[PDB]
Structure 1
Amino acid sequence: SYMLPHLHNGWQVDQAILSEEDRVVVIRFGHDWDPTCMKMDEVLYSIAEKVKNFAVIYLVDITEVPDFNKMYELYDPCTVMFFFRNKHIMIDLGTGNNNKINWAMEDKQEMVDIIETVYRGARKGRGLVVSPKDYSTKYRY
């Protein structure tokens, strides 16, 4: 299904990124049939109407639009990137790299916190923000 809008080419991607001025643009790069992307898309669909106020979500198929792979280093199954007014925002998740997500989380509540923190940091002007939790460990006990 994936009723969320999909972007089919770099032109559409850039137009969508530049269209918004006061809402964070979320992009899920990956193949819709990969189970990791399936889980991520499920969560994003759940949170769409919750964070409609200050965020807009979009999905890109890597095969359909491969131009961004080299520049944005899209080689993992699924990645999530955040943009605001044509600026790429970084997040200190503690995983080692602050550019993308690159894995699938399962807690929509934490995803909501990430969106809120990224939006707040972008409005405050920071190009890099700090997530309110560290993912360096999988916190399994």
Structure 2
Amino acid sequence: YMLPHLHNGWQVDQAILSEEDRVVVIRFGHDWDPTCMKMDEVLYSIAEKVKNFAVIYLVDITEVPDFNKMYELYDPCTVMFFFRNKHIMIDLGTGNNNKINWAMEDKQEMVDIIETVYRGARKGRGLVVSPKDYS
């Protein structure tokens, strides 16, 4: 019951474009990467829980480098959020509102973040605050 993967820019475009009522969660990185391994285990374990309002996709940014420049994907692991084709920003308290770029292994915490993104974006917020301050 693995997480779905997207294998080119075109597929990523279609996936971001295809959800009217769910957050599109994208993990940019590589399966082989340790940070990605920890983040993937979280995403895998919450995928069923959030499936009504979020879909999660994994993208290998070697196989799919299309967005590297666009979203400055220079970290080992990057989770980003999209709603109705729009990049949703989250104030995590880190100074960077564009992405989660560390493996947070708190399962419920990740669920709560996704739910906040969904609830915010549905009400037209392009920026939302994370429930916990990450320093």
Normalised TM-score (structure 2): 0.98
Report the secondary structure of 2:105's partner residue: coil
CA distance in 2, matches of 1:123, 1:20: 12
1:4-53, Cα deviation, whole Å (9 max, x unpaired): 11100000000011011000000000010011100100000000000011
Q: How many residues in Structure 1 have an aligned counterpart in Structure 2?
A: 135
Tell me by how many angstroms 1:65 deviates: 0.3
CA distance in 1, matches of 2:123, 2:84: 13
Which runs of 5 or more structure 2 residues have no equivalent in the other structure? Answer: none
1:107-131, Cα deviation, whole Å (9 max, x unpaired): 0010011001000000111000011
1:57-92, Cα deviation, whole Å (9 max, x unpaired): 000001000010001000000000000001100000
Which runs of 5 or more structure 1 residues have no equivalent in the other structure? Answer: 137-141
Tell me by how many angstroms 1:3 deviates: 1.2
Structure with greater Cα Rg: 1
Tell me by how many angstroms 1:96 deviates: 1.2
Alignment-derived partner of residue 94 in structure 1: 93
CA distance in 2, matches of 1:101, 1:4: 18
